[PDB]
Every structure is written in structure tokens, then in C-alpha cells.
Design a protein around this ligand. Structure first.
Ligand SMILES: CO[C@@H]1O[C@H](CO)[C@@H](O[C@@H]2O[C@H](CO)[C@H](O)[C@H](OS(=O)(=O)O)[C@H]2O)[C@H](O[C@@H]2O[C@@H](C)[C@@H](O)[C@@H](O)[C@@H]2O)[C@H]1NC(C)=O
Ligand SMILES: CC(=O)N[C@@H]1[C@@H](O[C@@H]2O[C@@H](C)[C@@H](O)[C@@H](O)[C@@H]2O)[C@H](O[C@@H]2O[C@H](CO)[C@H](O)[C@H](OS(=O)(=O)O)[C@H]2O)[C@@H](CO)O[C@H]1O
Ligand SMILES: C[C@@H]1O[C@@H](O)[C@@H](O)[C@H](O)[C@@H]1O
Ligand SMILES: [Ca+2]
Ligand SMILES: [Ca+2]
Ligand SMILES: [Ca+2]
Ligand SMILES: [Ca+2]
Ligand SMILES: [Ca+2]
Ligand SMILES: [Ca+2]
Ligand SMILES: [Ca+2]
Ligand SMILES: [Ca+2]
Ligand SMILES: [Ca+2]
Ligand SMILES: [Ca+2]
Ligand SMILES: [Cl-]
Ligand SMILES: [Cl-]
Ligand SMILES: [Cl-]
Lengths: 149, 149, 149
């Protein structure tokens, strides 16, 4: 019976969809995702900002964005080394924007930064003690992605 | 056509189901699951027992339960801090029961425990050295979930 | 309906395939896979060689094999303790081959190794210093699987 088989296929597909979602939930949890909080993941590879951005988008996430101290601390702990943040002033020098949109609100700049040093620095890294510093987007820094809460 | 197209699709689904199962095995392995041993995992978040029960059930798992010394050690090494166990005497004071049913078969109580201290303590936490202490279910401890061997 | 439901199911299956691919990409990333580089994974379990082979095959991978100084270091870092390599001279004493097939293209043998000591040693482990040493395949060493770049 073709219709009986089609209904089974629907049931099979639905079952699969539910299991894949459970697998994603389990993975996030094992990656340290706290309930109702976005989580961060890194492979500890250093690369230019454009590569991090491409990579994270490929994973349906975005370059990590600290929107408060807790998140800043979380990113610092995941990264373990200097890493790019999803913040840049490439569009208009001096005005930092999130890669996903909007002007920067919470910030944790290191003393005397951002300084757009020399020829210029339009990207941002989370460095020592979790403070931030603007740097050339061409530099290679750890890739840390954030995924929705 | 229809029947052939349908049969081909059923084959595709079966293949996808196998792939997901492989994804699950590899995830558990990368997370430290030992062959033939239960898989214990945590996000390192502390929360009330009710929250833990909810979280693990949502992942289609259960609150970690040590049935022997080997499992107690395994849970201890996953939690790294104090964590709730799936054991309570909430229903009947003095008689600890697994959240999945049954009376205790193995216990590892710390000296002077269980004491049902003060207003009463119905939940169990695996603390330092792997020893157990009964505490208020409302207190916040690490969430450790258990998955099949 | 029939044809419409069937065509939709096809799109549903195709959507699921993409999602699972994404899940696999994200999991590899979480496991530390570097772009275009092969990656090694371990659950840190010690078992005999036959078991390692069986387990990695079950994960659709192969027992870790260092093709150069770089990979040799990479494996050593993942394992943390002496692990088996996908190299043995089981077939013909003295002729070490990859479990995947072929003669050695690279090797980092310690002085006077391999020596087929005593009752015999047909397996190889990466010691806690990069060097190789042939050991008994019955010994329990850390299981490290390798997946392609
Ligand atoms: C007096 O201000 C500081 O001057 C030094 C020297 O010019 C700055 O450091 C240089 O910054 C360059 C930025 O592209 C580059 O990294 C230089 O390295 S190298 O010589 O090309 O190898 C580096 O010496 C310094 O900038 C800060 O520190 C840098 C290391 C870099 O992280 C910048 O983003 C920082 O802003 C200046 N510091 C301040 C506080 O103005
Ligand atoms: C170069 C050589 O001949 N070395 C001998 C040495 O074997 C090496 O070291 C072992 C520990 C082992 O890793 C071997 O694979 C190395 O080639 C001998 O050591 C003994 O080796 C046996 C066989 O594995 C065994 O491990 C012994 O330990 S046991 O007693 O616990 O079983 C180990 O001592 C050494 C012994 O005389 O002779 C060296 O010439
Ligand atoms: C403060 C109380 O001290 C005692 C312990 O047994 C209780 O669990 C509680 O921690
Ligand atoms: Ca600029
Ligand atoms: Ca700038
Ligand atoms: Ca700067
Ligand atoms: Ca399953
Ligand atoms: Ca009680
Ligand atoms: Ca009690
Ligand atoms: Ca107590
Ligand atoms: Ca031999
Ligand atoms: Ca040999
Ligand atoms: Ca030897
Ligand atoms: Cl720049
Ligand atoms: Cl209580
Ligand atoms: Cl052997």
C-alpha cells in the first residue's frame, strides 16, 4: 500500500528530525552550553578575521561577541589565547559595530585602545585578562564561534 | 516510478539513520565514553535538582547514578565539583530511591551522612573524594547526565 | 496528494542530509579539527590493538598514523599517554606496514627499535616523547582514531 508506506516515511522523517535535534542539544550541552545562554566553541586554530567569519557562518554561528562581562569571561575561557571578536570598525572608522549589526554597547578595551595603530586596525581581539585590543584584520588569531541561546 | 521512487527514498532514510547513529557514537567517544560503560556528561552548570532532572530528561537521558565504585569514580571525574546524583528520599524520608525507580544498591556516604540536616535534606550530592552528602534539592550543584552503555 | 507528498519528502530528506553534514562539521570543529588537516580523537581508554582497530572502524575512521613529524606531534598531544599507531609487522616479522596498507613512508624509531623483544612485539606505540617503540599488541594502550582532512 503506497499510502501506508508514505505515512511511515513521514513518521520516519519526523523521528529522524527529533533525534537530530536531540543530538544537537546533547552536543551543545557537552560543549558547556548553559541553559538559555548562547555557547562558544573553538578548534584553537589561528586565522585571519575573514576566515573566522567565513568558518563560523558555515557552521550557522557567528564570530564570538561578548555582550557583557559574563560572556566575556566565557569567551576568554574557551579561547585560551588571543581571539577575534565579532566586532569591527571597518564600515566607518571609529564606530565599532557587531558583525551581525548594531553599534557597540558593552566594551572591555585595554588601556589606550582602540588606537587604530599605524596604517590601521579595524578588527578586535580578546587578549590578556579578557581585555580587548583593536588589530589588523589580516592578523591570525584564534577562531571562536558563538551559537544561539 | 512512484513505488521505485518510494523504495529509493526509504533506502536513503535508513542510510541517514545509520549516519546519525555514527555521529552519536563519535560524539560520545570524543567525550570520553568508555566501551561498554555508561556515558556521563556535564555542561558544568550548577542548578537546583528539579532543573537537573528537567535538563537531563530533555536530552533524553537521566540524572547520573553510580551503581558501583567504578561508576562513582567516572561521575566524580566528569563533574570535577559537587554534583547531584539521581537519588532522593523526597517521597519517604530515610529510604533513598533512584529517580528511575528502585532502592539503593550502592552508596558512598561521607561520615555522619545522611543527616537530613536542619529543615531536611532529600537530595544527594557526590562531593569531594567521591563521597556523598544529602542536601536540600533547592541548593545548586553541577548537572551531570547519564546515557546508556 | 501522493506525488506532492513524495516530492516534499525528497526535499525533507535532502534538508536532513545537509543538516547532518553541518552537525558533523560542527562536531569536528569542536573536537579541534584544523582546516584541511586530518584530526585525531581519543576517549582515553586503554585497550589491546585488535580492539582499537575494531573501535576506529566502527567510527568509520582508522587507528592514528603519523605521516610526518607534525602529525606525530599531533597524535602525541591528543593521546597524552602511550597510544597504539596503525602500524604493525604482524604480516611479516620485520616488515612494518600501515593497517591501511603499504610500507612506512615516515618513522621515528627510538635507537635499537623496533626489536621484537622477547616473546615478540608486532605493534607500535608513540611514547611520551615522540619516539616510536614496537610493543606487544596485547598490551593495553590508549585508543586514538584518525579521520580524514
Ligand atoms: C607607543 O604606542 C605603541 O607603539 C608600538 C610600536 O609602534 C605599538 O606596537 C606595534 O603595533 C603594530 C600594530 O600593527 C605592530 O603590531 C607592531 O609589531 S611589529 O613591529 O610590526 O612586529 C607593534 O610593535 C603599540 O600598539 C599596540 O601593541 C601592538 C603590539 C598591537 O597589539 C597594537 O594593536 C596595539 O595598539 C602602541 N601602543 C599603544 C598603546 O599605543
Ligand atoms: C633495545 C633492547 O633490546 N632493549 C631491551 C628492553 O626492551 C625495551 O624496553 C622495554 C620496556 C619494552 O618497551 C621493549 O619494547 C623495548 O624494546 C628490555 O626491557 C624489557 O622488555 C620486555 C618486553 O617488552 C618487558 O617490557 C620488560 O618488562 S617486564 O619485566 O615488566 O615484562 C622490560 O624490562 C630489557 C630487559 O632486559 O632488555 C633490553 O635489551
Ligand atoms: C550546612 C550543613 O552542614 C552539615 C551537612 O551535612 C549538610 O549537608 C549541610 O551542608
Ligand atoms: Ca579603518
Ligand atoms: Ca579602526
Ligand atoms: Ca590597537
Ligand atoms: Ca539512536
Ligand atoms: Ca524528607
Ligand atoms: Ca532526607
Ligand atoms: Ca547532609
Ligand atoms: Ca611477529
Ligand atoms: Ca615484530
Ligand atoms: Ca620494542
Ligand atoms: Cl584592519
Ligand atoms: Cl530537600
Ligand atoms: Cl605482538
Amino acid at each position: 500500500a503506497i499510502e501506508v508506506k508514505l505515512a511511515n516515511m513521514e513518521a520516519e522523517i519526523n523521528t529522524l528530525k527529533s533525534k537530530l535535534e536531540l543530538t544537537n542539544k546533547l552536543h551543545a550541552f557537552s560543549m558547556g552550553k548553559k541553559s538559555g545562554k548562547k555557547f562558544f566553541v573553538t578548534n584553537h586554530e589561528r586565522m585571519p578575521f575573514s576566515k573566522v567569519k567565513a568558518l563560523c557562518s558555515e557552521l550557522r554561528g557567528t564570530v564570538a561577541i561578548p555582550r557583557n562581562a559574563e560572556e566575556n569571561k566565557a569567551i576568554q575561557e574557551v579561547a585560551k589565547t588571543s581571539a577575534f571578536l565579532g566586532i569591527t570598525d571597518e564600515v566607518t572608522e571609529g564606530q565599532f559595530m557587531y558583525v551581525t549589526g548594531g553599534r557597540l554597547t558593552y566594551s572591555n578595551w585595554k588601556k589606550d585602545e582602540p588606537n587604530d595603530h599605524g596604517s590601521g586596525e579595524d578588527c578586535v581581539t580578546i587578549v590578556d585578562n579578557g581585555l580587548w585590543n583593536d588589530i589588523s584584520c589580516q592578523k591570525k588569531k584564534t577562531a571562536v564561534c558563538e551559537f544561539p541561546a
